[PDB]
Amino acid sequence: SAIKPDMKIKLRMEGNVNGHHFVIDGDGTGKPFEGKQSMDLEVKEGGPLPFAFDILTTAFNRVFAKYPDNIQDYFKQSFPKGYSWERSLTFEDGGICNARNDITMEGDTFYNKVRFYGTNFPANGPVMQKKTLKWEPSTEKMYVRDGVLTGDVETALLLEGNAHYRCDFRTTYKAKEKGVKLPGAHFVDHCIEILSHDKDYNKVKLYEHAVAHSGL
Numbered sequence: 659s660a661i662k663p664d665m666k667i668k669l670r671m672e673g674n675v676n677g678h679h680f681v682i683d684g685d686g687t688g689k690p691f692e693g694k695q696s697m698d699l700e701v702k703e704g705g706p707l708p709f710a711f712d713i714l715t716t717a718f719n720r721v722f723a724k725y726p727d728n729i730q731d732y733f734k735q736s737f738p739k740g741y742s743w744e745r746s747l748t749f750e751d752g753g754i755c756n757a758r759n760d761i762t763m764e765g766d767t768f769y770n771k772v773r774f775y776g777t778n779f780p781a782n783g784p785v786m787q788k789k790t791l792k793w794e795p796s797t798e799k800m801y802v803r804d805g806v807l808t809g810d811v812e813t814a815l816l817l818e819g820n821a822h823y824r825c826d827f828r829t830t831y832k833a834k835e836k837g838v839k840l841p842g843a844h845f846v847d848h849c850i851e852i853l854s855h856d857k858d859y860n861k862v863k864l865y866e867h868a869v870a871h872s873g874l
Contacts, residue, residue, distance in 0.1 A: 660738040666767040673774035680704030693724030706858030710790040717757040723868035730841035736833040750824040753779040795849040
């Protein structure tokens with residue numbers, strides 16, 4: 659199998675949020691068949707970021723999701739050539755982001771070319787004031803829309819003060835190889851965590867656990 663039980667992760671994100679430019683590198687490992695990954699992230703340009711690091715973290719690969727035999731694993735079947743995704747994030751106070759990842763594999767390593775653009779965040783809102791604590795665990799609803807594998811999440815960031823900040827996002831996923839069969843509709847349960855950080859989140863250790871299921 660192109661995909662090993664233990665794989666490395668290399669990533670560079672470039673982007674702009676409310677006009678603030680940044681570049682962030684990532685280097686990690688994961689267990690594709692266990693649905694688990696961690697990575698060290700380092701801000702290389704634009705630090706200290708003037709917005710909540712949390713809005714970025716889902717953009718830092720559904721190959722790291724535990725799929726049962728009874729669901730088609732579109733992501734593992736996309737390798738070795740790889741796949742891309744495009745995501746829209748809509749926040750309840752009008753903030754909007756668009757992100758993309760082009761994912762390839764070179765030997766034991768997944769390479770990730772990540773772009774993240776955000777705009778229309780209110781200056782006084784929890785993103786630009788850095789009031790976020792974490793994403794809540796979520797369920798991604800996977801289905802096919804207009805011939806394209808689509809995943810929808812309705813979720814929230816926990817804020818300081820027992821308040822939540824709602825976000826909906828929609829991801830479209832496309833294998834590079836023509837002919838990779840679309841899966842049936844299913845769920846992917848996710849939990850993403852910042853395990854550690856430095857003062858201004860110039861350095862972050864990020865973890866994700868994801869499991870695909872049919873709801874039973």
